Amino acid sequence: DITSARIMSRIIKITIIVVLVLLYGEHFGMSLSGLLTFGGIGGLAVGMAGKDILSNFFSGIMLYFDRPFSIGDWIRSPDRNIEGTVAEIGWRITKITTFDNRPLYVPNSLFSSISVENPGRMTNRRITTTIGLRYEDAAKVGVIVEAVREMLKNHPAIDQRQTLLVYFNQFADSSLNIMVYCFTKTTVWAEWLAAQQDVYLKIIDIVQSHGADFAFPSQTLYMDNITPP
Amino acid sequence: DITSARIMSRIIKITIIVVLVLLYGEHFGMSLSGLLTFGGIGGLAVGMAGKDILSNFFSGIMLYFDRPFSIGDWIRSPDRNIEGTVAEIGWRITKITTFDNRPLYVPNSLFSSISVENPGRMTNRRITTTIGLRYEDAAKVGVIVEAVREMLKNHPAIDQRQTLLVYFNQFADSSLNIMVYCFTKTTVWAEWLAAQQDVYLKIIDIVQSHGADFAFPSQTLYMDNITPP
Amino acid sequence: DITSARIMSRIIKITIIVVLVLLYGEHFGMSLSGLLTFGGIGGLAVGMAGKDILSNFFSGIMLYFDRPFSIGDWIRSPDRNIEGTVAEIGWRITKITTFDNRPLYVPNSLFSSISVENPGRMTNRRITTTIGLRYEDAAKVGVIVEAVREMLKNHPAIDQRQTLLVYFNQFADSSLNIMVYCFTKTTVWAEWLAAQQDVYLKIIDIVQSHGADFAFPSQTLYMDNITPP
Amino acid sequence: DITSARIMSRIIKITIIVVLVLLYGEHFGMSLSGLLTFGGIGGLAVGMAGKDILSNFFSGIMLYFDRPFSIGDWIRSPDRNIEGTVAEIGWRITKITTFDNRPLYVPNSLFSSISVENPGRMTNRRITTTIGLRYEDAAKVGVIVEAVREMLKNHPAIDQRQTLLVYFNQFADSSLNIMVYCFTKTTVWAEWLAAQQDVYLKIIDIVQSHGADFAFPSQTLYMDNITPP
Amino acid sequence: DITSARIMSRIIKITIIVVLVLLYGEHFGMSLSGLLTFGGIGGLAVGMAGKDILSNFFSGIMLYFDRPFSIGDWIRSPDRNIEGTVAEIGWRITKITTFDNRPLYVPNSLFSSISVENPGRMTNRRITTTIGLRYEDAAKVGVIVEAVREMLKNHPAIDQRQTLLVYFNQFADSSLNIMVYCFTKTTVWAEWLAAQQDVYLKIIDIVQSHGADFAFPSQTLYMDNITPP
Amino acid sequence: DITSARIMSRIIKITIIVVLVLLYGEHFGMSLSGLLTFGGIGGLAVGMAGKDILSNFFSGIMLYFDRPFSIGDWIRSPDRNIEGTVAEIGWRITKITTFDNRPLYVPNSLFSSISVENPGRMTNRRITTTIGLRYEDAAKVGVIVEAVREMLKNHPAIDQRQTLLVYFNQFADSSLNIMVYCFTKTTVWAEWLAAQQDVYLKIIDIVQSHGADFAFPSQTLYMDNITPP
Amino acid sequence: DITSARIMSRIIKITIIVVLVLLYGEHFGMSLSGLLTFGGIGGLAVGMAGKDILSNFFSGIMLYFDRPFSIGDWIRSPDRNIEGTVAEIGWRITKITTFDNRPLYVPNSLFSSISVENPGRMTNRRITTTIGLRYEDAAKVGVIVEAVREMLKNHPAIDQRQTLLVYFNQFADSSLNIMVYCFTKTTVWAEWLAAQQDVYLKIIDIVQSHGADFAFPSQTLYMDNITPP
């Protein structure tokens, strides 16, 4: 915009006139010590006010040098909400496309103090879940675990080079949970979901094939009758 | 107001007199070192007190240069509550109209340290939901998922170029949740709500038609009946 | 309070003597460097201690120039608890009358770093609610929605130029919720409450006129009697 | 502790001798630059370390100048827990008598950055509550409201010049809550509680006069049986 | 420990050699400006690093001069967890014996920025509780309140000069709570507990003397029978 | 690898060359004033960057002088998670052994701003618990309290010189809780647990000896039947 | 993209010409005081902006000297979420592989202010669990505890040199909890899980061998009837 050009011209004019008066003040402007003090105060205020912008620019330069992410991939941070697919990497501001298709303008300085996670560069997608048996299938926990583990071992979509754990490890207050923890070969978010659904259906079939069943949030009641007779 | 102009003139006169005494102090005011100390202390205090206003002004300039938002679109921030429609962008503060029609005055400096989202520039509005089947019907999960996916694919208000996912991926503590995740073509908040309602009614029809039902928060009770005989 | 004056005079005298010794002590007081460093340290410590007090005054000046609120208006902030109707705006601290009829003295500095919302300046009061049908009456949602909408279209206390939405958009845990979102023409907190009550009663009448009903929080019990035979 | 009085004397002696050496160092001590930098570093360390005391003293002076509270009245802050009755106001700390009859020593600096509320200076006490009818009483809500309102218009202990609101505005999860919001004309904490109790008893009587019968959580049990034959 | 003395001697040697080189550098070395900047940077870094340690000592001096707590009384802070009995007060570290007989070493600096409560110096112990009647005995509230108030007024362990409030002021969701708020004469934690137990037993007797038994978390079931025919 | 000593030597060489150029710039380096500000800015940046590292070493020195803990002691802090058994105390980093036998490397600076508790030096271990009767055995509260108190007083593993409290002081939501609060003579975590188990079993025996019987959550229901006829 | 090298060379040129002009300005650029002011302002602003980047590099150097972790080791921090396996330690950024196989980029400065835990250097894995007996079978707690202790003492996968605790210590609101606390010899996350599953199954067998079942979330329901006849 032409008005933006006008604003830049005004800013550079103010800066350059300040520089000239400070640099050539001693020649004409008396009290070089007074000019020293005034310029020091002004510069200190300006810098301690614009430190945010300067940090943004320097963080942008750093991001450009070392690349925690590229345009295509999507990022997230446990410390702060910046999740989304990066659209543009600017000097001061980076635009990220959220998963609801909304722009998100992240100052670059934010990346100098938080740990940035890059799921776009991940190698595998993880499937984690719990079974949660019924406290009366305790005699069947071992066979259920073995069957689930064998099913996961022969699943085409499961990566056999990664960790594949199926173990009764929780012992919750209303169920005997069995952790299932594996990885898929694909990282597409549609093949992964299909594989997860298939694994879950196979798990249901395995659990119900034996005499076991999943548990609801059970209770005991100790019912008492106090209604008038 | 007259008093506002009076206050501005008083501030200007104070600035002028301090500038004059600092610049011409050496000529008449002795103690060049003492004048240095006094002026430096005063300037440091003033600047370290007004850094907030200076930051507001600089952030306003930056907002003018980089344009996260216009004067018509609505914005929000995950970090802080600034949600609303931008009413006007000032040099020091931005006036935003909240969705309950209340003015909100946001200092510009906060825009230099938070990530600003701009839903006003969004491309599509997303419909996300969960089914949560009655959990005693797991043999009907696949057919229900397929029917819902086909219904969404054939829906005229759903954008077919965006992600369209319908998958069982949960094992909820009381239900078999099926995530549904799609996008609409419109972004008007009135056609989007109508499309969402239509999709939800279609989903209800699909679920009921397949001999399934939505789940409530179930539990088991193990009745004891300790009432006195 | 003669002491108010005594302490002010004492502070003025201390400041004056410090200024005299720092400014006219260059010749009588030897060690220009020593007095320079002494005065610098003292002034720096005083400034770092009084930065908050100076910030209060500067923020008061800014509030006087830029006016987020006036005496009559009642304000609030998402970031801090300053809710109430402002009683007066001092240079250093503003006192606000809370809705308990209690005075609350808020320093001006806080207004330089928080978003100040001014509900006193609003144009409309918003009515928002949800219906939450039993989920056994999903066939009556649509009709009911329309009915409610029509009622809000004909209500004399509802502003027709503002947002007016009535839609099923939830799939709640135990009910089918219908968001109602409208604005009233008045902003007086007494006609608004009366209009809200009238709208709610009309909504009850509309819901019960059909075969629908509002839902309680339900769960499926599944009892397995284990009392001794 | 005579030794600590000697320690105080030693502290003041150290301060005075350091000042004298800094001011008389040049005459005997040499390397004006070295002495200057040593004094500067020492002063910077002392100022950065011993700043809380100066801030507390300045905040105490300010508290004396502008009086957010006096000795008798009790104060509270939404930001920090300082609730209690002011026992005495010192230069660095204030003693506040909590409602446990325990002394609480609040540094003065805290008062320079938090909003201080003075309930001791309030003009009225507020009675606020909700009714919460059964949800089978909708047809009787209106009259109920009116009745309650009338009971508050004729109550000797209710201030008629303040806001007096009685309205159905909630649509709660298990009840039809009616907000009651009024003010008493006493502020002594014993007649206020008595008036509140009287108003609550009158509200109970009014509600029972009609078939209203304040509600309970009221969940639907959606019962099923799986006990083996 | 001899090595502690060795470390102290090493620190003293480093300090003295630094002082000698910086203060007599010009007479022996050269580069007044270079030595000045080097010494300044070094001293500034050391001060920024040791500000916390210096603050500890300054806060210890203040804690001696102003005495929030003595050598035997127990303290606590709503801001920080420092609860316990003061074991000893050092120049930098204060040792407090927690109530589980475990030492706690708190830096003195913390006491300069938090409000310290000293229940060791309190005058009375407070008894506060709620009754919570069955909510079907509202006609008994007045007589029960009067009886409890008379019992408290006639109790020999209750301080009659302090506040003594017994009032129905709640409208809980499942009961009619009655606040009881009084003080005891003793403050020794063993007779206070005995008096509290006696008051509680007397309250139980008073409540059950009238047909106004206490309240449990009531509910309203609304059963739907869905068992297969 | 050699890279450690190589990097140390490189850092030493860089520091030495910087010192030489800055301190001999006076002789050959032109613009004696320019190099002064260059070195000043460089040193300010380096110190402001390494303040944390310097503070770590200073806090290590302080920890070596003042001894909150020794090698064998296991420590914990309410402010931050550092719980574990000290493994070694370094100059910058302290190595702690967690109770899950994992190393934990705590920067020494952490200990300069948090209160460190040292359970390793406890004198006694504490047993605290509550009984929780049923509201129907309120007539037995006194007798049970006396019996438990006598049992604790006669127990051989309980320290009689410490506080020994057994009192009804709660009025729980669904029970009459009796607080029990005593100390054991041992502090070894194995005899303490055995003594606690023995005390708990004796408490169960005492409670069952009378008809108290250890209340449950114990709510009320008020059944309403809406089942279709 | 050679533009990266071009921008790096531009930065080098800027930072070298600044040094050239500042160090040679005194020869040709007048106003030594003004030039010093400008240079100091620029350096101070750049330092405040790049302190974070400088701290990252210094923390990287220290992390190389002191080694909290190595490449293969997997680390975590109670303060920040940095959990994962270290991929590579850089000068400014450390790359860590999370357990969901995605990279995480942690600035080195984070390691200078948080305590880093290294379960990679862990020696033994811990098995900790709770039993929670039926809470009406307290007479069997001792026998169950002894049996479980013997089972753990005779288990070949349990380290007998570590702590091995099995004790009743809780009085849960619905159960009598037995804490079990032991260590396993292996640390491979696969034999540990197998050993934990075996121990849990043996615990179930022991608990059910002599009649004592696990507790559910019990209640005392107190049914009351208010349905119309």
CATH of the domain at D114: 2.30.30.60
Cβ proximity of B200 and B128 under 8 Å: no
Give phi and psi for C18, each to the nearest 5: -60, -45
- The angle subtended at Cα F176 by Cα F175 and Cα F178, nearest 5°, is 130
Asked if G112's CB is within 8 angstroms of F56's CB, the reply is yes
Q: Do chains A and G touch (3 or more CB pairs under 8 A)?
A: yes
E201 with E131, same domain: the answer is yes
C126 with C197, same domain: the answer is yes
Distances (CA, A) of F54 to D27, E10, F43, F58: 36, 17, 14, 6
Give phi and psi for B174, each to the nearest 5: -140, 5
Q: How far is G1 from chain F (nearest CA, A)?
A: 32
Asked if G118's CB is within 8 angstroms of F103's CB, the reply is yes
Strands of F74-75's sheet in order across: F74-75, F84-89, F93-97, F103-107, G116-117
Closest CA to E101 of F75, F189, F122: F122
Half-sphere exposure of A13 (CA within 13 A, CB side): 6
Distances (CA, A) of A161 to A30, A184, A185: 78, 10, 9
Which amino acid is present at B188? V
CA separation for the pair G121, F100 (Å, rounded): 12
Asked if the C-beta of C134 comes within 8 angstroms of chain B's C-beta atoms, the answer is no
C-chain residues near B227 (CB < 8 A) = none
F-chain residues near G141 (CB < 8 A) = 197, 201
Give phi and psi for A52, each to the nearest 5: -65, -45
Asked if the C-beta of A67 comes within 8 angstroms of chain G's C-beta atoms, the answer is no
Distances (CA, A) of E11 to D161, E5, F57, F65, G163: 73, 10, 13, 12, 43
**Interface with chain C: mutation pick from B35, B41, B208, highest number of C CBs within 10 Å:** B41
Q: Tally the residues of chain G.
A: 229
Distances (CA, A) of E115 to C106, D81, G79: 20, 8, 26
F-chain residues near E104 (CB < 8 A) = 115-118
DSSP assigned state of F85: E
**Shortest CA distance from A145: residue in chain G:** G197
A140 with A201, same domain: the answer is yes
CA separation for the pair C27, C32 (Å, rounded): 8
Give phi and psi for A128, each to the nearest 5: -130, 140
Residue G155 — left, alpha, or beta (φ > 0 → left; ψ -120 to 50 → alpha)?
beta
E-chain residues near D192 (CB < 8 A) = none
CA separation for the pair D41, G205 (Å, rounded): 72
For chain C, the C-alpha Rg in angstroms (whole number) is 32
Which amino acid is present at B3? T
Q: What share of chain G is helix, strand, coil (3-state, %, to 5)?
A: 45, 20, 35
B115 with B127, same domain: the answer is no
Asked if the C-beta of F34 comes within 8 angstroms of chain G's C-beta atoms, the answer is yes
Buried-exposed string F50-85: b where 16+ CB fall within 10 A, e elsewhere: bbbbbbbebbbbbbbeeebbeeeebbbbebbbbbbb
Q: How far is C5 from chain B (nearest CA, A)?
A: 25
CA separation for the pair E198, E127 (Å, rounded): 11
A128 with A116, same domain: the answer is no
The contacts of residue E42 (CB under 8 Å, 6+ apart) are D41, E18, F43, F47
CA separation for the pair C224, B224 (Å, rounded): 10
D135 with D190, same domain: the answer is yes
E133 with E86, same domain: the answer is no
- Show the beta-strand stretches assigned E in B16-92: 74-75, 84-89
For chain D, the C-alpha Rg in angstroms (whole number) is 32
G148 with G165, same domain: the answer is yes
Asked if the C-beta of D224 comes within 8 angstroms of chain E's C-beta atoms, the answer is yes
User: CB under 8 Å, gap of 24 or more: what pairs does G152-156 form?
Assistant: G152/G180, G152/G182, G152/G199, G155/G195, G155/G198, G155/G199, G155/G202
Asked if the C-beta of C33 comes within 8 angstroms of chain E's C-beta atoms, the answer is no
- The angle subtended at Cα D22 by Cα D18 and Cα D26, nearest 5°, is 140
> Cβ atoms within 10 A of the Cβ of G71, count?
10
Q: Kindly list the partner chains of chain G, i.e. chains with 3 or more CB atom pairs below 8 Å.
A: A, F
Q: How far is G101 from chain F (nearest CA, A)?
A: 23
CA separation for the pair B3, B24 (Å, rounded): 31
CA separation for the pair F176, E18 (Å, rounded): 69
DSSP assigned state of C63: H
Asked if C33's CB is within 8 angstroms of D32's CB, the reply is yes
Give phi and psi for E67, each to the nearest 5: -115, 80
**Farthest-apart Cα atoms in chain G, separation:** 109
Asked if the C-beta of B32 comes within 8 angstroms of chain A's C-beta atoms, the answer is yes
CATH code, G189: 3.30.70.100
Asked if the C-beta of A162 comes within 8 angstroms of chain G's C-beta atoms, the answer is yes
C86 with C115, same domain: the answer is yes
Asked if the C-beta of C199 comes within 8 angstroms of chain D's C-beta atoms, the answer is no
Asked if F32's CB is within 8 angstroms of G36's CB, the reply is no
Distances (CA, A) of F98 to G77, G117, G119, G179: 12, 9, 10, 19
Half-sphere exposure of A67 (CA within 13 A, CB side): 9
Assign 3-class secondary structure to A51-97: HHHHHHHHHHHHHHHCCCCCCCCEEECCCCCCCEEEEEECCCEEEEE
Cβ proximity of D183 and D158 under 8 Å: yes
Asked if A222's CB is within 8 angstroms of B224's CB, the reply is yes
**Shortest CA distance from D134: residue in chain C:** C216
Which amino acid is present at B134? R
Give phi and psi for D165, each to the nearest 5: -120, 130
C-chain residues near B184 (CB < 8 A) = none
Q: Collapsing DSSP states into helix, strand and coil, what is residue A45?
A: helix
CA separation for the pair C202, D64 (Å, rounded): 57
Q: Collapsing DSSP states into helix, strand and coil, what is residue D97?
A: strand
Extract the tokens encoding G192. 């540990």
Kind of pairing, strands D84-89 and D93-97?
antiparallel
Asked if E52's CB is within 8 angstroms of F47's CB, the reply is no
Q: Collapsing DSSP states into helix, strand and coil, what is residue C151?
A: helix
Q: Collapsing DSSP states into helix, strand and coil, what is residue D118?
A: coil
> Cβ atoms within 10 A of the Cβ of D45, count?
21
Q: Do chains B and A touch (3 or more CB pairs under 8 A)?
A: yes
* String of DSSP letters for A181-226: EEEES--SSSHHHHHHHHHHHHHHHHHHHTT--------B----B-
Asked if C196's CB is within 8 angstroms of D169's CB, the reply is yes
Asked if the C-beta of C7 comes within 8 angstroms of chain D's C-beta atoms, the answer is yes
Asked if the C-beta of D102 comes within 8 angstroms of chain E's C-beta atoms, the answer is yes
C76 with C141, same domain: the answer is no
G146 with G185, same domain: the answer is yes
Closest CA to B148 of B77, B100, B204, B97: B204
**What is the extent of the structural domain holding B148?**
121-208
Buried-exposed string E149-158: b where 16+ CB fall within 10 A, e elsewhere: bebbeebebb
**Shortest CA distance from B168: residue in chain A:** A197
Size of interface F-G (CB pairs under 8 A): 193
- The DSSP bridge partners found for residue E125 are E184
The contacts of residue A153 (CB under 8 Å, 6+ apart) are A160, A164
E146 with E191, same domain: the answer is yes
D-chain residues near B216 (CB < 8 A) = 222
Distances (CA, A) of A92 to B63, B106, C36: 12, 21, 41
Cβ proximity of B164 and B182 under 8 Å: yes
Extract the tokens encoding D68. 């957010």
Q: How far is F132 from chain G (nearest CA, A)?
A: 9
Size of interface A-G (CB pairs under 8 A): 203
